[PDB]
Structures are given as structure tokens and as C-alpha cells.
Design a protein around this nucleic acid. Structure first.
Ligand SMILES: Nc1ccn([C@H]2C[C@H](O)[C@H](COP(=O)(O)OP(=O)(O)C(Cl)(Cl)P(=O)(O)O)O2)c(=O)n1
Ligand SMILES: Nc1ccn([C@H]2C[C@H](O)[C@@H](COP(=O)(O)O)O2)c(=O)n1
Ligand SMILES: [Cl-]
Ligand SMILES: [Mg+2]
Ligand SMILES: [Mg+2]
Ligand code: NA
Ligand code: NA
Ligand code: NA
Length: 326
DNA sequence: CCGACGTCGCATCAGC
DNA sequence: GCTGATGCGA
DNA sequence: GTCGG
């Protein structure tokens, strides 16, 4: 990409602040700057030119000038040399190992893939499955494979109850030619904002996907959110497909548009859009958009009959899913 | 300057 | 057990 | 780290 060197540098800084410094707001600010630069349609010539973009301030502009002049960033060259930072950044690549667990593991002398495998009993269930599929989860999913996965999920869900509707969201819905995982929004008319007329609505879909050996492992599961592992079937004598991460979110059927807005993302697009709502005097979540009173307290949900109604309230022109890849 | 920064589900743990 | 952080994830 | 009042 046009400014890939700069955006990679800012992404590495963001990951450092999240994993090592445990500074969540610095992480978000580095990712916001990388995102705005990533869609900037010129090859950046200077820090000053980048500082014109919202989210790029004085410090990033200085780093951009250093990187443009030398091709590298001294602050990052030193981070890469630091063993504790190196170890923490590696351990946090395992699903279920976050910043705190990674620092505790290094304290205990658990620093490598070899160390993790030797100490499975030090791992909670989520972490244990993240270690099991460590290599698989860093592989990307071709859209063609997403389409086969979509076919299985939709057809199995229809076999449980033809009134379910499953919608694949995430980067797939944004039209990406590959995805990092599969995100499935699920609705059923028995589950609305007003009542749950049927129990186990998420459970029985998960069970059916387990029965046909599509879902293979469970990271976490509740009444409305499943987080797990799935795998396409392979043909005779074929090498197996990698195992893939799958998230399934059951959303009240009447709140589908807020739900599909949220689950289509991207994550930065959601942050930007929800920050804009706040400035406009609204709060948006995966269920509702509600006004803010003078006291900063959310009011009653506003009527929503399309994704576009949500954009309208906050005075944004509508953006198709393919233009939300921030 | 400096307060705010998106919002929430599930797993885990501490205190009662 | 309940409740309210806190961790990690979407 | 950046922004807006
Ligand atoms: N911090 C987050 C993370 C995710 N999300 C939402 C938006 C996003 O699209 C998400 C699905 O999570 P994801 O991590 O799978 O994000 P994707 O957009 O699908 C993706 Cl580009 Cl990271 P990938 O999964 O295709 O690699 O749910 C969010 O709102 N806030
Ligand atoms: N998972 C889904 C997807 C769509 N829908 C509903 C919302 C609208 O009434 C209708 C529109 O479908 P679509 O947005 O796919 O054009 O389907 C649902 O209830 N659950
Ligand atoms: Cl709500
Ligand atoms: Mg995804
Ligand atoms: Mg602000
Ligand atoms: Na700027
Ligand atoms: Na992790
Ligand atoms: Na996901």
C-alpha cells in the first residue's frame, strides 16, 4: 500500500502500548492514526503533511519524519531488542493470553512456544485451545473458503429451525477477498428485545454445528455469544484445512440493524462512528441508538428501520459495508 | 490545560 | 451463591 | 497520543 511502511510502524507501536505498556488509549490512538493514514490517497512526504489528518498529532508526525528519513524508528529498534517486550509480544499472540497473563508467564519463566506446550496445565481452557491452534489461527481464510463455510452454517441452521436467519458479517460482509475468521450474526423470532419465548436458541445451533463436526472446539459460550473453532471438511486423500476461529452472536431480532452494523465493523469504524454519535448527543451499541440527556444519561431507544437510519441520526452520509474497512 | 477516548459478552477471582 | 471488578475478547 | 472546549 501507498504508506505501508508508516502504517506498519504505527501498528507495531500500537501493539507495544497494548501488550507491554498496557496503555489502552495509546493503543487506540496509534490504530486510529494508522487507519486514517492507510486510506489517505497520497504517498506521504513529511510528518507535517500527515499531521493534517485527524488522529495524527505532533509525536506521530515526528516519528513519520524519522521513518521517512531513515526507513526505521529508533524507538522500535530498541523495543525489538528488549527481551521482556519481545516475550510479551509473542505470548499475547496466543488467543486467551492478554497483557497481564503474558507478563505473569514471563515472570514464571514461561516465554516460548516450547515453554507453553510444556506447561499446558498452567493454561485456562481458552488459552489451551489457543495454543493448540496457534499456527492455524494466524493463517488467513480465502473468500472461496468463507463461501463454503457460509454454506454449511446457513444450511445447518436452517435444519434446526427454518426461522433462524444467519448472516456472515465481519470483513466478509465488507467484501474482503480474505478474512481472519468467521463472524456469524444469528436471529430467531422467538428472541426479541421484549421476550425470550424459547430457550437454548444459540445452544442448539452450536450443537448442530458440532454434530456435523464443523464446530470443533469452544473457547467461551453463553446465552447470546459463542466463541469457538470450526473446520471445513476435506476430501479423500486431501490435506486437512486449517482450523478457523468462529464467533456467533445471537441478536434480538427487532434489533438486527444495530446488531449488523456492530458486527460488520470494522472495529475502528465502530469506534469512530460511536465517537461521532457521542459528539452528536447519541450513544450507539449493538442493540440501540439512544439520545443523551443533558446529564449524560442515555434515554429511550430511537426507531431504527435500516442501517441507514442509524447514520441519519448522527448526520453521517450512508456508507456501504465495503466502505467501512477502516 | 485536561477530561474523555465505544460498548459490551463471557471467564475468572475476590470479598462477603 | 451473589456481586462487582478485572481480563480478554467481539 | 490526540483532540476539543
Ligand atoms: N474491538 C472490537 C472488535 C470487533 N468489533 C466488531 C466489529 C468487527 O467487524 C467485529 C468482528 O470482529 P473481528 O475481530 O472478527 O473483525 P473483522 O472486521 O472481521 C477482521 Cl478485518 Cl479483524 P477479520 O476477522 O476478517 O480478520 O465485531 C468491535 O466492534 N470492536
Ligand atoms: N440475520 C438476519 C438478517 C436479516 N433479517 C431481516 C431484517 C429485515 O427485516 C430483512 C432484510 O434482509 P436483508 O437485510 O438481508 O436484505 O431481514 C433478520 O431478521 N435477521
Ligand atoms: Cl440498549
Ligand atoms: Mg472477523
Ligand atoms: Mg473526544
Ligand atoms: Na491531525
Ligand atoms: Na492473545
Ligand atoms: Na471474530
Amino acid at each position: 500500500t501507498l504508506n505501508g511502511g508508516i502504517t506498519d510502524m504505527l501498528t507495531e507501536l500500537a501493539n507495544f502500548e497494548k501488550n507491554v505498556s498496557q496503555a489502552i488509549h495509546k493503543y487506540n490512538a496509534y490504530r486510529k492514526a494508522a487507519s486514517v493514514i492507510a486510506k489517505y490517497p497520497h504517498k506521504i512526504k513529511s510528518g507535517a503533511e500527515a499531521k493534517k489528518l485527524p488522529g495524527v498529532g505532533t509525536k506521530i508526525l515526528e516519528k513519520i519524519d524519522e521513518f521517512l528519513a531513515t526507513g526505521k524508528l529508533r524507538k522500535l529498534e530498541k523495543i525489538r531488542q528488549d527481551d521482556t517486550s519481545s516475550s510479551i509480544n509473542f505470548l499475547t499472540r496466543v488467543s486467551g493470553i492478554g497483557p497481564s497473563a503474558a507478563r505473569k508467564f514471563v515472570d514464571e519463566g514461561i516465554k516460548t512456544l516450547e515453554d507453553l506446550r510444556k506447561n499446558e496445565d498452567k493454561l485456562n481452557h481458552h488459552q489451551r485451545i489457543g495454543l493448540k491452534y496457534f499456527g492455524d489461527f494466524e493463517k488467513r481464510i480465502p473468500r472461496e473458503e468463507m463461501l463454503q463455510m457460509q454454506d454449511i452454517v446457513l444450511n445447518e441452521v436452517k435444519k434446526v429451525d427454518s426461522e433462524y436467519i444467519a448472516t456472515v458479517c465481519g470483513s466478509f460482509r465488507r467484501g474482503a477477498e480474505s478474512s481472519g475468521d468467521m463472524d456469524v450474526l444469528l436471529t430467531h423470532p422467538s428472541f426479541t428485545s421484549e421476550s425470550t419465548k424459547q430457550p437454548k436458541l444459540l445452544h442448539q445451533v452450536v450443537e448442530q454445528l458440532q454434530k456435523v463436526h464443523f464446530i470443533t472446539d469452544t473457547l467461551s459460550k453463553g446465552e447470546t455469544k459463542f466463541m469457538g473453532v470450526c473446520q471445513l471438511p476435506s476430501k479423500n486423500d486431501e490435506k486437512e484445512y486449517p482450523h478457523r476461529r468462529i464467533d456467533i452472536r445471537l441478536i434480538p431480532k427487532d434489533q438486527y440493524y444495530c446488531g449488523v452494523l456492530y458486527f460488520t465493523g470494522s472495529d475502528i469504524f465502530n469506534k469512530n462512528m460511536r465517537a461521532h454519535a457521542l459528539e452528536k448527543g447519541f450513544t450507539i451499541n449493538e442493540y440501540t441508538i439512544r439520545p443523551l440527556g443533558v446529564t449524560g444519561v442515555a434515554g429511550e431507544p430511537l426507531p431504527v428501520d435500516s442501517e441507514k437510519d442509524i447514520f441519519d441520526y448522527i448526520q453521517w452520509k450512508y456508507r456501504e459495508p465495503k466502505d467501512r474497512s477502516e
